[PDB]
């Protein structure tokens, strides 16, 4: 995918789930975001499309308390504010 440089608080989040680089592909960023959502249990297994990120750094970065994984455009918009290409 395309090469992006996460801003400092997104880099911290990614490194907290074992990412090792300063520069990533978008596919890597999405992967590590998912690992973070899992390790912080920001979802309920019986409605797995919903992310609950209020009161978490993820919600601070994204600007929302919750979102659905089906909001493709909105998720990219929220991620891109935390990255430079």
């Amino acid at each position: 995918e395309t090469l992006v440089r996460p801003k400092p608080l997104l880099l911290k989040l990614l490194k907290s789930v074992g990412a090792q680089k300063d520069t990533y592909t978008m596919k890597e960023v999405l992967f590590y975001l998912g690992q973070y959502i899992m390790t912080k249990r920001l979802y309920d297994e019986k409605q797995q499309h919903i992310v609950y990120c209020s009161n978490d750094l993820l919600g601070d970065l994204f600007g929302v308390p919750s979102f659905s994984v089906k909001e493709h455009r909105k998720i990219y918009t929220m991620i891109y504010r935390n990255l430079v290409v």
């Binding site: 596919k27 992967f31 998912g34 690992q35 979802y43 797995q48 499309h49 994984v69």
Partner: peptide
């Protein structure tokens, strides 16, 4: 779209 994530 399963978090353990990305199509």
């Amino acid at each position: 779209v399963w978090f353990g994530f990305x199509x």
